[PDB]
Amino acid sequence: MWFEILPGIAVMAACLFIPGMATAHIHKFTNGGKEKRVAHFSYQWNLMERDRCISGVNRYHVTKGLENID
Amino acid sequence: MFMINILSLIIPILLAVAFLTLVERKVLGYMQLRKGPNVVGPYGLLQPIADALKLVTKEPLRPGTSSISMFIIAPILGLSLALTMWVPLPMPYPLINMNLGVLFMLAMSSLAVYSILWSGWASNSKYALIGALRAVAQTISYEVTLAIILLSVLLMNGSYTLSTLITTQEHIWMIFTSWPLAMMWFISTLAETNRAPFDLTEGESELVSGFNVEYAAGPFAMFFMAEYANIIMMNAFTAILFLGASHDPHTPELYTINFVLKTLALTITFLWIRASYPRFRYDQLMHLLWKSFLPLTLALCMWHISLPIMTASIPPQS
Amino acid sequence: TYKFVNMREPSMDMKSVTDRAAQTLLWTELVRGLGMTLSYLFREPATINYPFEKGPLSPRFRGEHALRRYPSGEERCIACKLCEAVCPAQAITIEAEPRADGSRRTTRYDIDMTKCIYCGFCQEACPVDAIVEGPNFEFSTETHEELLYNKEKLLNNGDKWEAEIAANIQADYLYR
Amino acid sequence: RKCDPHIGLLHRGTEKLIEYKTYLQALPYFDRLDYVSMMCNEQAYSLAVEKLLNIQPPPRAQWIRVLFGEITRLLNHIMAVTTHALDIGAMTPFFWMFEEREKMFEFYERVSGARMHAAYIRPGGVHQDLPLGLLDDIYEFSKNFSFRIDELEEMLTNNRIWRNRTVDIGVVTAEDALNYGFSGVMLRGSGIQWDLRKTQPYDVYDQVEFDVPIGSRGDCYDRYLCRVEEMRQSLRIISQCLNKMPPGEIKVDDAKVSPPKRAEMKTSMESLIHHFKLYTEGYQVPPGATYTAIEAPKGEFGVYLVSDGSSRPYRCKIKAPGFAHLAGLDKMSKGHMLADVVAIIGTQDIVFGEVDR
Amino acid sequence: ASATRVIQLLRNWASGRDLQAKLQLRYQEISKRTQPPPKLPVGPSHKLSNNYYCT
Amino acid sequence: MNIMLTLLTNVTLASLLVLIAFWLPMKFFLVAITFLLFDLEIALLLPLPWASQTNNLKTMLTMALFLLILLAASLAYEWTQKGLEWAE
Amino acid sequence: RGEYVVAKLDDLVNWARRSSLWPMTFGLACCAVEMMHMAAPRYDMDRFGVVFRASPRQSDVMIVAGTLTNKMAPALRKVYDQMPEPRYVVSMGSCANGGGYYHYSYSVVRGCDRIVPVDIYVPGCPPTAEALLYGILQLQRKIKREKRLRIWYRR
Amino acid sequence: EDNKQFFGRHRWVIYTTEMNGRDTFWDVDGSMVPPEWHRWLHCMTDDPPTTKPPTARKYIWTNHKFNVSGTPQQYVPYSTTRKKIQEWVPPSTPYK
Ligand SMILES: CCCCCCCCCCCCCCCCCC(=O)OC[C@H](COP(=O)([O-])OCC[N+](C)(C)C)OC(=O)CCCCCCCCCCCCCCCCC
Ligand code: SF4
Ligand code: SF4
C-alpha cells in the first residue's frame, strides 16, 4: 500500500492551517469583522488617522457614514 | 491581540518542523520500498516526539576546543531566523505586510550563512572547519542566482510587496510565464536549503553531518531542525511566487487550503528529489552554478526586463 | 565471445543534437529517474512485520545446538567426540567417563556459543545424530556468560525443542 | 597527490590458523575471506584441494558450482554497484535490488542451511543435494531479476549526475593496469581483453556460453557498466546451467575424500571407518603445491596451497583480488578530487576481508 | 497483486514498463515448502564387482 | 514595534528551548571574492521594478541592460581567463 | 503521589529512548553485511526509531559488527568515549562476542568485553538479520525495565 | 494465515496477553512460539500443528519457555565435571 503516509500528511495540513485562519480571524476580530487596512504609502496611512480621529473612540475600523453628517 | 497571533504563527510552524523528520524517514522508505517509522505511534505519528525528546534529554556535549560563547549563539541565530522569516509570508493577510518583503526574505536568507560559518569556527576541528568553509562558499554562490531570479520574477509582478503576489497572479500561474526560471528557481532552493543534490553538510555520509560533525543532541536540536524549517518555507515561497492561488476576501479559507496543499505537495517533491539523485561534487556545484546556471539566469533577466517594455506591460507598483 | 560496453557513437545530425540539447536544457533523464522512484512509491512494500511476521527459513537451518534423546529416553551422545575433532573453532569441550550403567556418557559437554560458528559440521560428525543445530535464533543475551553453554543447558535445549527438530531431520536425512 | 591506503584494521592471521587445522576445518576460513562473494572462495579452495588430490568432482556437482558461482556473481555486483552508488551517495537504487538479494539469499538457506557462510562447496563435490523444488524457485527469481536491473540502469546509467561525477574519473592505462597486478573488472573495464572462464576454462564454465563486457576508456563509470553487463551475462549462465542439470551424485564416489552417505554411515563398516577418519584428521593430500586461481566476482582469487603430505595444509597463501586493487588507490586518486577517492573505492568495491586476510 | 487497476497504470506509466507481468514479490509461484521424499541417486562406481580401489 | 515584538519573541523561544536542551539533560578565496563583486553589481539593479516605471524608460532600457551585459562581461572575462574554473 | 509522578516521568523518558535509538554502524567483517540487510526492506528497522542520522556523536547504541583487532582496539575505544551517554554497545556475531572462529589468533582480542562494556550479546556467525532485530527489540525492552528516575528518588 | 498475501507476510501471529505470569501486551517478543508452531509460522513447512501434531515424547517440555535472560531465571556457566584431585584429609588427635 501507499496511503499510510496520508495521516502523516494530514496532520501537517492541520498544523499549517492554524496560521492561515488565525492571522485572518485575528484580523477580523481586531478590525471588527474586517481586514487590517494596509498602508503601503503615506496616503493609506493618514487616511487611517483621518478615520481613527473622527470615530471618537479612536479606532480606525469603526466607520461613521451618512448617519453622522447632516 | 498581536501576541496571540505570534504564537499562532510560529508555534504551528515549529511543531510541523519536528514532524517533518517522520516523512523524511517514511516517504523515502515507501519509495525505497521500506516501511518508514510505523511501530512507534499509530502510523508513526509519535516518532518525531520520540526523536525530539531524547535530543532534549541526551547529554549536551561541549568539546573542549569549542568556544562556549560561539557554541550557543549559532543555534539560536539559525532557528530564530527561520521563525522570523515566516512573518511576511502572505497567509491570506500576512502577519507582517512589509512593502519590501521580497528583499526582507532574501536579506535574512543571507544572514543564515553566519549560522554555519560560526559553528564551523566554534567546532574548531580540521575536517570540521574545511567542511563548513566549503559549505558557506556554496550557499553564497547560490544567493547571486537567487537574487537574479527574484529580480526578474517580481519585475513582471510589480513592487516587492509580498501581498501583491496574489494580485498579479490572478488568472494564470506565474510559472506559465517564467517556467524557464521556475526550474532555475527551484534548483536554487534545493541548494540554499542544504538538500540533495546539495545536502553536502547534512549528508549522512557526505560530511557525516557537516554542520553537526561534533554537534550532538541538546543544542543540536536547533541546528538540524532549522534546515528542515527553511525547506517548508522556501518551497512555500516558490508556491507564492509561481503557484499562486485565489483569495476571496469574504472567504480566506480557500487560499489557505490551496496554498497549504500546494506547498505540501512541493515539499513532497523536495523529499522526492533527495531519494532520486546523487550528490554533486564540490567542483560540480560551481560548474553547474557559475558556468551554466549563472549565464542562463542573466539571459532570462535580459528577456524579462524588455518583455514588459516590448508589450507595454509594465506593472503598477501601487 | 565478448562485447564492448561504452562504444556508442553520438550522431551529429540536426535531429540527434536536438534531443541531446533538449535533454540538457529540459532535464528528461532526471525526470526519468523521478518517474522510476515515484512508480515505486505506489509499489507495495515488502517489510516483514517482526515479531508478528517472521522471515522464511528452510528445514536445514543451523543454530542453537541441542543434544537429543532416543525414543527410550537416554540421550544420544555416546561421547564419540568426532564433533570435538571436527569443530573448526574448537568451541566444543567434551570429557568422557564410564557411567555407572557401563555405557559412555559425557560428564562435560560445553560448546562456547561465542566460539562456535554454526557451520553445521557437528551434526555431520556424530553417527548417532546426537548434536544438531536447531531452528532457534532467538537466544540473544545480555551477559557474555550465558552464551557459554554446558551439558545441562544443551540437554534442556534438546528437551525444549526436540519435537520441532524431530521432524526437521526426518525431512532432511534423505538429502544427507 | 599521494595516497596511502593503510590496512590491517580488520587483519586476521587467517592462514596462521589454517596450518593448525585440516582441510575440512580450513574451509570455513575461505567463506569468511570475502564476505561478499563467499561461495566463490569455496570454489577456489575446493578446486585447489581436489587438484592436488588428483580427483575430479562429479558432473552434478560441477553444474551446481556454476549455478551457485553465478548466484554469488549476482550478489557481488549488487554489493559492488549499489554501495559504489552509496559511496557516491545514492541510497534508493542501492536498496531496491538489495531486496532481491534476500531471494537467492533465502535459496542459500534452502541448500546449505546457513545464510552467508554456506560451507557448501567442499573438496570432492558439493556437501548436500539441492532441495526439491528449489530449481523452480531459481527460475522464478531469474525470470524477474532482469526487470530490476533495467530499474538500476535507468536510475544510474542515463542520469547526468552519475556520469559527470563518476565518468572520466580514475582512468588507468592498459599496460599500467595489468603490470600493477590488477585483475577482473580492473582489466576488462580498462580495455584489457582477458577473462578467466573464457581463457583458462575451469570446471564446466567452458560448456556454458556468455559474453565478456570489456570497456573502452576504463574509468569508474566504465567499470560500473562492466559490472552491470556481467550481471546480465550472469543471468545467461544461470539460464543454461539450470536447464543443463544432470542425473548424478553431489560428491565424488571416493570415501577417502568424500563423507559416505548417512544411510551407509550406519550400515557398513568401511563407511563407518572412512567417515570416522575423515572426521578425525581429514584426508591425506599428496604433497606439492599449486596456484589454482579462478575469477572472483571482484577479481582474480587464487590460493598457493602447498601441502607437506599430512592430513593438514602446510601453507596456504590466498591471493587477495583487492590486494593489488587497493594498491592502485595512489594513482586513481592522484590528480583527482577528494570525493573521487571513495569513487575509486566504490568502483573497486574494496571489501575488507581479503585485502586484510 | 494486491493493488488496484488505476494504481497499476500509474506505476506502469511512471516506469514505462509492465510491472504486473512480473513483480519482485512471490505470491503463488513459490514451490510448496513441504516436498515429497527426495530419493537420491547412487555413486557412479556403486557396484558389487570390479570396483577395487586399485583402479 | 510589531516587527521588534516578532523578532524578540523568536529569540526568546530559541533561547528558551536551547536552555532546556543544556541544563535539563586561493580557490577558496576566489569563490568568495567573485561572489562579492557579482553581489555588489547585483545591488545596482535591485531598484529595477520601480525604475521600470520611470517616465523615460527608453534611457532605462539602454542602461538597465547595460549593467546586465557587464554582469555577463565580468563573468566572460573571468571564464575565459580561467576564473570560474577554480585552481585545482 | 510522589512515586506515581516519578513513575510517569520514568515511563515518558524510557519510552522515548527505547523507541528511537540512533545506532552507529561499526561493521568490520561479514557481521556488517547481515545487519546491513536489516536496512534492506525485508527486515526494515527504520520502522521503529533506528534511522540514518548516523553521526557517531548523534548516536545512542553502537553495534560492533565483525572481528575486533588489536590495531582496531584503541580507535574503536576512543569512539566509545566520544559517544555520548546513554551509550550501549551491541555485540554482533561470534567474533565480536568472544572472538569466535579466530579466538586462538594473535591479531584479535577475544570479545568486545575487554574493550567496551557490552550490554547485549547476539550470537550467530553471522547472526540472521532478523535475529538482530530481536536483539534490538530485547535491548528495547531492556531500556523499558530501567529505573533511572526511580533510583534517584530513593536517594 | 493469508495465502492471498505475498510470501513471508502470508502467515503471522499475535501473542498471548498473559504468557507464563509476565504480561505480554506491550511486551511483544518473538520468543514465545512453541516448538510445534516454530515450523508453521516460519514457513518451514505447510502442516500446522492443529493438522499435524508433533511426535509426542516423554522428555519433551510440556511448556515452552521464553528467553529467560534478564529475569532471575537466567543461566550461569558452571563446571559439570567432578573434582579429581582430593586432599589428604589429615587425621587428628596425637602429636609427633
Ligand atoms: C520565447 C521564449 C523565450 C524564453 C526561451 C528560453 C530558452 C528555452 C528554454 C530553455 C530551458 C529552460 C531554462 C534552462 C533550464 C536548465 C538550466 C541548466 O543549466 O540546465 C543544464 C544543467 C547542467 O547540465 P550539464 O552539467 O549536464 O551540462 C551543462 C553544459 N556544460 C557541460 C557545458 C556545463 O542541468 C541541471 O542543472 C540539471 C538539474 C540539476 C538539479 C537536480 C534536480 C533536478 C530536478 C528536475 C525535476 C524537477 C523540476 C522542477 C521544476 C520546477 C517546478 C516548480
Ligand atoms: S557448528 Fe561447527 S563450530 Fe559450531 S560446534 Fe558444531 S562443529 Fe563446532
Ligand atoms: S559428535 Fe555427537 S556423539 Fe560424538 S561426542 Fe559430539 S555430540 Fe556426542
Ligand code: SF4
Ligand atoms: S562472528 Fe562469524 S560472521 Fe561475524 S565476523 Fe566473526 S566469523 Fe564473520
